[PDB]
Design a protein around this ligand. Sequence first.
Ligand SMILES: Nc1nc2c(ncn2[C@@H]2O[C@H](COP(=O)(O)OP(=O)(O)OP(O)(O)=S)[C@@H](O)[C@H]2O)c(=O)[nH]1
Ligand SMILES: [Mg+2]
Lengths: 168, 302
Amino acid sequence: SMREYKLVVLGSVGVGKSALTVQFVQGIFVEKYDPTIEDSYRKQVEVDAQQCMLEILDTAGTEQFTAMRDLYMKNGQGFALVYSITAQSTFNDLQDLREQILRVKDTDDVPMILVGNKCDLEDERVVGKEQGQNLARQWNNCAFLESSAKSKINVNEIFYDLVRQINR
Amino acid sequence: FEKVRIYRMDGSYRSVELKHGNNTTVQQIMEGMRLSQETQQYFTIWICSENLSLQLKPYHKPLQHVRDWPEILAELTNLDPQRETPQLFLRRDVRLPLEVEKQIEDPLAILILFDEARYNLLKGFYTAPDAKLITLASLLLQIVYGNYESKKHKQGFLNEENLKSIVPVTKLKSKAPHWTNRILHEYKNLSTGVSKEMHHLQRMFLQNCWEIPTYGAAFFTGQIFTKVIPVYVGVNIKGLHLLNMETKALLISLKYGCFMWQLGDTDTCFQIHSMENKMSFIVHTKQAGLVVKLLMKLNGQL
Ligand SMILES: Nc1nc2c(ncn2[C@@H]2O[C@H](COP(=O)(O)OP(=O)(O)OP(O)(O)=S)[C@@H](O)[C@H]2O)c(=O)[nH]1
Ligand SMILES: [Mg+2]
């Protein structure tokens, strides 16, 4: 039967976690955005010749909803840690998320990908691609992509990469 | 802080804050969805369990209905106490006129309508000729697997596991395994003019469902006597439909203006008379009042 994958999208407010998830799942991108408490999406995809059922949790970017946060990390199989290349503060915030996940899983062997979103807004770039790479490397050569929900750059790849990691 | 999950038929949900606790209304909850002011008018909140799915009104307070479900069940059904907790769903408003739906172009509305229609198809609630079911299956293939590739799909692809995702469960073991070649050919031709963009494909699926007579129906439960037969009573913008509960077979389909209804003694049954063939039947159900109220409203909007 078709295997199911519990994916979790984490990161600070406004980085594009919802935009990335909705672009991936529904193929929609609009400038308009609605704030998120907790949304779950489902999508069937093919990864490495195999049909996969993805369940993607789109989270609040805030320390609110602690019960949810602890539960995300307990149940999540793979985690996308998203920041915006236009906002230094969102890049800075990802370190504690990373440490929390490893603490809950009690292993550094967790499917994870570091995502630098909004890569289409080059004129407002604050976080250098080399810095994103530098962080990923610091994180035991964790996977790393720059993405754009708007232009559909690396959107699918984010979820596909997590699935491949889970399959290992 | 309090919130609620609002599900859709595919298992997805969106959490919405309850700013007034259990006193929060359907209207206020609808504001927390991702819909626009325009597209909210296509959908509303339903409360659903295995034995009963009810459309809620804008002034209703969905959490109290959840709270009161045992009492609601005793009132509307013949059932003994049940163990299931209902959930809240976003679903097509039963009152949405087909003429209005046929013009929707909003991608989010289309996908939501699409997913619900797909759900009804697989569940067996859409009766249609084989040709029609085959067209629908082929579109589902295009939507999920992308373009037909002979290498991938010609042989050893459409097995029992993935047929169950493209044809009604009521056809799955009977005659679906003889449509496999017909399904693949329609899928192929779809790939080889027609926009392959996701939302266009989803609309095409919908266009094929729009002419199915039970499309968009609210379903109630009841019984008729020939032996007592448990039935689904479907009411939609086209008319009244009766399904055998067990097999989903379409027993009766009547268009507005071709039949009359009468609510019985108390809300325990309703009678239907044909204007044309002078035949008639009684449906026993404690939802008789709800059915008649809805027949009236939907007939009334034309
Ligand atoms: N140009 C561009 N804009 C984007 C991109 N991703 C998101 N945005 C925009 O940024 C804004 C916030 O996106 P959103 O997806 O709501 O952030 P979030 O991370 O989901 O926000 P939150 O719930 O933690 S508060 C939206 O206006 C959205 O259109 C992108 O890749 N490129
Ligand atoms: Mg969000």
